[PDB]
Design a protein around this ligand. Sequence first.
Ligand SMILES: O=C(Nc1cccc(-c2nnn[nH]2)c1)c1cccc(-c2ncccn2)c1
Ligand SMILES: O=C(Nc1cccc(-c2nnn[nH]2)c1)c1cccc(-c2ncccn2)c1
Ligand SMILES: O=C(Nc1cccc(-c2nnn[nH]2)c1)c1cccc(-c2ncccn2)c1
Length: 260
Amino acid sequence: AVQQKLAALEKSSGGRLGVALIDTADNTQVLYRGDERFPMCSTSKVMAAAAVLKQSETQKQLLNQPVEIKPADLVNYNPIAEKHVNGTMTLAELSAAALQYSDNTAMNKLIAQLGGPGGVTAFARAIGDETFRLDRTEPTLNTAIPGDPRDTTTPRAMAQTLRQLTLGHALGETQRAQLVTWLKGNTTGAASIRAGLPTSWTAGDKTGSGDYGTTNDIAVIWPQGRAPLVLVTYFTQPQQNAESRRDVLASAARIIAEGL
Ligand SMILES: O=C(Nc1cccc(-c2nnn[nH]2)c1)c1cccc(-c2ncccn2)c1
Ligand SMILES: O=C(Nc1cccc(-c2nnn[nH]2)c1)c1cccc(-c2ncccn2)c1
Ligand SMILES: O=C(Nc1cccc(-c2nnn[nH]2)c1)c1cccc(-c2ncccn2)c1
C-alpha cells in the first residue's frame, strides 16, 4: 500500500523514484525500485568521508593533516574551499565541508586521499557493499545519464551501508559518532527527506543533485519514541535539463512516515 502510494507519487512526478527504508525497531525494510541503479551525486560524499574516518582509526592524527588548496583545485561549487585557496584545510575540515555544505573541492580532496574514485569503491567493498561504485571525481560524477552505471548505487544497498556506518560497527565508535555529528549538522537538507517528517523527529542527512533533474537524499532519523530509521530517496528525470524536485523526496518521506 505504501508501494502503491509511492507509485502514484512517481507517476505524477514524471520521473523515476527509488526508496529504501530500514526500520531498526524490527529490521524490516520498505523498498520501491530498491534494486534499480540511480546516480548517487553528492550522496556519495558520505562514503568518501567515511573512508577517511576509517583511515583515521589507525592514524589518530589524520584528521588534523593539512591539505593544500590551490587555485587550480577549485571546481564548480566550493563555498568553503574557496576561502582557503593558497592555504590549507585539514582532512576534518574537508570532511565537514563536503558533508555539511556539499563542497565539491572538498570531496575531490577526500577522493584523492583514498587514491582516486576506486579507493572509495574499495572501502565500500571492505564494509560489505558490493553495489556502490564511484568512477569519477567532481563535478563529472553528477552527469546522471540514464542507463550509465558510473557513480551509481541502489536504494537497498545505500540504506544498508548508511545503517552500518551510522548505527552499526563499520566504523570505530569515535568515528561513527563523528559521522553522525556531521550528518546532523548538515545545512542543505530541510527541503528534502526532513520536510516530510514530523517536526518532533531529529535526523542527519546528505543531499545530492545532478543533471537529468536528479534529486537525492539519504538520512538517519531518530523518531519520537521509536528506534532509529534509515531512509534513502533517489529521484531522476528523463530530460537533461529537468529542474530539481526536493518536494518529491519530501513527499516520499511523508508516505514512509505515515506508513510506520
Ligand atoms: O592505489 C591507489 N588508487 C586506487 C585507485 C583505484 C582503485 C584502487 C584499489 N582497488 N582495490 N584496492 N585499491 C586504488 C592510489 C593512487 C594514487 C595514490 C595513492 C597513494 N596511497 C597512499 C599514499 C600515497 N599515495 C594510491
Ligand atoms: O553547482 C551546482 N549545483 C549545486 C551546487 C552546490 C550546491 C547545491 C545545493 N546544495 N543544497 N541545495 N542546493 C547545488 C550545479 C548545478 C547545475 C550544473 C552545474 C554544472 N557544473 C559544471 C558543469 C556543468 N554543470 C553545477
Ligand atoms: O556538481 C554538480 N552539482 C552539485 C555540486 C555541488 C553540490 C550539489 C548538491 N548537494 N546537495 N544537492 N546538490 C550539486 C553538477 C550538476 C550537474 C552537472 C554537473 C556536471 N559537471 C561536469 C560535467 C558535466 N556535468 C555537475
